[PDB]
């Protein structure tokens, strides 16, 4: 009994385009009745909307119950925080609402309220109108946490607005505390520490890990203490435990494994994540990693060209 | 030549587009008394002419384009040094750079237009790409010679990605990545303002180009394991104060037609809102200073090593109290 956990970016897709072999890889598992999940540090859309897109592109039925995205574990926080600043692309508002967050504010809602809060926002008037909403108690009800769902697309605004929140007086908009501290005014969560990721471009691009480093750098500058943030996403144990539960529930719904193989392109997320958790791993060369790159101390079970190689070589050798 | 003033703009004369109460009156007071002044700002984006036209209209005084130093004004000295520059800032900085004489100006939005996948987290709308960017001859086949940050750009995920690409490239060629790690960037990079904070219309101080610089530097360190060797101008740098001193000298000569740092004046008073730029800059250069409370500085904030000559409420108090004591 083996199962697979596939990364998406640099393994199944580059952007919206499938990698050759990705469709065949999943079709092969389905023929053989081998369970799989998708475990991605990407996000932005609902689990349903994302799996609908992947299903269409790869010509397989991927269930919303087979996927863990960066933000999926934020379901665990819905009873902890009444009002959240949900940072990400505009779609993350709906995702957070769907999880059951009581009071969701998107960062663009603050830009709508007062453009002078974010002097270097690139939002056009049309983008403000489309992306944001009027929040009538934006200034009178405190924020309880900042949750970064995915990489937002207006960083001078996004970073300013996050900084305002984590240096505020107890989460109240338009306030600035006097006290310097490593503990932010309200808690802040990052869902992906990937410095780099693989999109259609030939060179690795910065991801949410890079965004996090930037937020942290300015927090340190203002406070003289490092930020006490929360982190999820691969390689964190929290995300692997979450994925493990999704996989167990999926395996039951198909109806515990001798081995789980993480298939990834990034040593620093996928491979270390699996290795720390006790999962096996197959490092592909179609994304962040190029053969010759420093593996440091991760030790992938197999190193292979692409996802179809990962599945076929793993099955031949281990199933 | 008893005295001249050098005024900061943001948090001293203006908050955003709105004059601070007394700002117009302060300049009119100097002009009635034939006391010369310059404007020395770490802001920028538009030409010295366009900027002084706007300020003139809003303060109802005649400010000459020869009376202003903006963050990027000293980039005039670099025009024969670097053929192709990545001119980073708001779209208006393309025209400012071209106006200065740079041979081959590329704006960061030109690279986003060339390939959107370079900047996956760009916020540019299609309409903004059409408005801001240009097709650039030989974008992919001619090296970039430097990155010059003119002012704060307004799409930082793209801006930071694109700057990082340049300073880690194979000798400035787009679409490349060098093999080696070093403190020395692939091509030189200049920042024109190290202001962590600045004062706009909002009541809380907002991050400025100094913050942007710290972000670029952080990701450079992450990729290279060595701190970035950059060039920095703007207040409080000696380069910028020297440049401003020469603009003042030239302006006084024009009008007319001591210490080394104030020549030909007995005293030069910097009027600023930011201890970390205006005050320490003036102090290190040899100028006197007035610190106002209408911008970044709040009463009781720690002044660290800065010792302003006077601390006052606003720009009109700065002028009136300085003239009383020092004129
Ligand atoms: Mg990946
Ligand atoms: Mg935009
Ligand atoms: Mg100022």
The verdict on a CB contact (< 8 Å) between B218 and A217 is: yes
Take residue A249 and report the two structure tokens written for it.
């529930």
- Give phi and psi for B65, each to the nearest 5: -60, -15
B314 vs B25: CA distance, rounded Å: 11
Q: Are B88 and B163 in contact (CB under 8 A)?
A: yes
After which residues are there C–N gaps above 2.5 Å in chain B? 257
Take residue B9 and report the two structure tokens written for it.
């703009």
B55 vs A130: CA distance, rounded Å: 34
Q: To the nearest whole angstrom, how far is the Cα of A126 from the nearest Cα of chain B?
A: 9
A317 vs A314: CA distance, rounded Å: 5
- Give phi and psi for B146, each to the nearest 5: -165, 160
What distance lies between CA B296 and its chain's CA centroid?
16
What lies within 8 Å, CB to CB, of B224 at 6+ separation is: B168, B181, B182, B183
The verdict on a CB contact (< 8 Å) between B222 and A195 is: yes
Domain limits of chain A?
A: 1-69+233-319, 70-232
What lies within 8 Å, CB to CB, of A267 at 6+ separation is: A283, A288, A289, A293, A295, A296, A298, A300
Q: Which CATH superfamily is domain B71-233 in?
A: HAD superfamily/HAD-like (3.40.50.1000)
What are the CA-CA distances from residue B202 to residues B15, B112, B199 (Å)? 8, 30, 7
- B1-70+234-327 and B71-233, same CATH topology: yes
Number of C-beta neighbours around residue B107 at 10 A:
26
Up-side HSE of residue A318: CA atoms within 13 Å toward CB? 21
Q: Are A264 and A274 in contact (CB under 8 A)?
A: yes
What lies within 8 Å, CB to CB, of A160 at 6+ separation is: A117, A118, A120, B206, B207
Placement of tokens 């962590």 in the chain: B196
Q: Kindly report the CA angle at A214 between A209 and A217, in degrees rounded to 5? A: 125
Q: Is the dihedral of CA A285, B170, A201, A151 positive or negative?
A: positive
Q: Kindly report the CA angle at B49 between B44 and B51, in degrees rounded to 5? A: 40
Q: Are A271 and A281 in contact (CB under 8 A)?
A: yes
Q: Which CATH superfamily is domain A70-232 in?
A: HAD superfamily/HAD-like (3.40.50.1000)
Q: To the nearest whole angstrom, how far is the Cα of A120 from the nearest Cα of chain B?
A: 5
CATH classification for the domain delimited by A1-69+233-319, as one of 3.40.50.11820, 3.40.50.11540, 3.60.20.10, 3.40.50.1000: 3.40.50.1000
What are the CA-CA distances from residue B45 to residues B19, B71, B91, B92, B149 (Å)? 18, 9, 8, 6, 10
Nearest by CB to residue B118, choosing from A122, A201, A214, is: A201
Tell me how far apart the terminal alpha carbons of chain A are, to the nearest angstrom.
7
Q: Are B229 and B184 in contact (CB under 8 A)?
A: yes
Q: Kindly report the CA angle at A62 between A59 and A66, in degrees rounded to 5? A: 155
A64 vs A78: CA distance, rounded Å: 20
Question: B125: burial class by Cβ within 10 Å (0-12, 13-18, 19+)?
Answer: middle
B4 vs B271: CA distance, rounded Å: 11
Q: What is the DSSP string of B222-242?
A: HHHSS----EE-STT-HHHHH
Q: Are B308 and B291 in contact (CB under 8 A)?
A: yes
Q: To the nearest whole angstrom, how far is the Cα of B132 from the nearest Cα of chain A?
A: 12
A191 vs A77: CA distance, rounded Å: 13
Contacts 24+ apart (CB under 8 A), B91-94: B91/B131, B91/B132, B92/B45, B92/B46, B93/B44, B93/B45, B93/B150, B93/B151, B94/B134
Up-side HSE of residue A187: CA atoms within 13 Å toward CB? 13
Placement of tokens 């962040």 in the chain: A288
What distance lies between CA A83 and its chain's CA centroid?
21
Nearest by CB to residue B211, choosing from A122, A203, A218, is: A218
The verdict on a CB contact (< 8 Å) between A155 and B156 is: yes
Spell out which residues have Cβ within 5 A of ligand 3, the ion. B 8, 10-11, 273-274, 295
Question: Among A157, A158, A163, which residue's Cα sits nearest to residue A188?
Answer: A163
Instruction: State which approach was used to obtain the coordinates.
Output: X-ray
After which residues are there C–N gaps above 2.5 Å in chain A? 255
Ligand closest to Cα of B206 equals 3
Give B297's contacts in chain A (Cβ within 8 Å).
Answer: none
Nearest by CB to residue A119, choosing from B115, B123, B206, is: B206
Placement of tokens 């590329």 in the chain: B106
Name the 3-class secondary structure at B198.
strand
Strands (E) across B172-254 are located at 189-191, 197-198, 206-207, 231-232
Report cis status (omega within 30 of 0) of the bond before A102: no
What lies within 8 Å, CB to CB, of B129 at 6+ separation is: B109, B112, B113
Expressed in Å, this structure's resolution amounts to 1.5
- Give phi and psi for B167, each to the nearest 5: -85, -5
Q: Are B60 and B26 in contact (CB under 8 A)?
A: no
Question: B255: burial class by Cβ within 10 Å (0-12, 13-18, 19+)?
Answer: exposed
CATH classification for the domain delimited by B1-70+234-327, as one of 3.40.50.300, 3.90.1170.50, 3.40.50.1000, 3.40.50.620: 3.40.50.1000
Q: Nearest chain B Cα to A113, which residue? A: B202
Q: Nearest chain B Cα to A114, which residue? A: B202
What are the CA-CA distances from residue A164 to residues A146, A169, B160, B277 (Å)? 11, 9, 21, 22
What lies within 8 Å, CB to CB, of A64 at 6+ separation is: A46, A47, A48, A51
User: Distance, CA A9 to ligand 1 centroid (Å)?
Assistant: 4
Please count the helices (runs of H) and the strands (runs of E) in chain A.
Answer: 10, 15
The verdict on a CB contact (< 8 Å) between B157 and A159 is: no
Q: Are B190 and B114 in contact (CB under 8 A)?
A: no
């Amino acid at each position: 009994k083996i199962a697979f956990a596939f990364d998406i970016d640099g393994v199944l897709f580059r952007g919206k385009k499938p990698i050759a072999g990705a469709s065949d890889a999943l079709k092969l598992l389905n023929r053989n009745k081998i369970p799989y999940i998708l475990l991605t540090n990407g996000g932005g859309f609902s689990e349903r909307a994302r799996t609908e897109f992947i299903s269409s592109k790869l010509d397989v039925d991927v269930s919303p119950l087979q996927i863990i995205q960066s933000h999926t574990p934020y379901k665990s926080l819905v009873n902890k925080y009444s009002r959240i600043l949900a940072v990400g692309t505009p779609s993350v508002r709906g995702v957070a609402e769907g999880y059951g967050f009581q009071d969701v504010v998107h960062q663009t809602d603050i830009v709508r309220y007062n453009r002078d809060i974010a002097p270097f926002s690139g939002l056009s008037d049309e983008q403000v109108m489309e992306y944001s909403r009027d929040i009538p108690d934006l200034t009178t009800k405190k924020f309880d946490a900042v949750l970064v769902f995915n990489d937002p697309h207006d960083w001078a605004a996004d970073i300013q607005i996050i900084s305002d929140a984590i240096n505020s007086e107890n989460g109240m908009l338009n306030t600035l505390r006097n006290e310097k501290s490593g503990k932010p005014s309200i808690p802040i969560y990052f869902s992906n520490q990937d410095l780099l990721w693989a999109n259609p471009y030939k060179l690795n691009r910065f991801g949410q890990g890079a965004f996090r480093l930037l937020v942290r750098r300015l927090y340190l500058e203002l406070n003289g203490e490092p930020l006490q943030d929360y982190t999820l996403g691969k390689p964190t144990k929290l995300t692997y435990d979450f994925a493990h539960h999704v996989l167990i529930d999926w395996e039951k719904r198909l109806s515990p494994f001798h081995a789980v193989f993480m298939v990834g392109d990034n040593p620093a997320s996928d491979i270390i994540g699996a290795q720390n958790y006790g999962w096996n791993s197959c490092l592909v060369k179609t994304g962040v990693y190029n053969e010759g790159d420093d593996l440091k101390e991760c030790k992938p079970t197999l190193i292979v060209n692409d996802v179809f190689d990962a599945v076929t070589k793993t099955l031949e050798k281990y199933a």
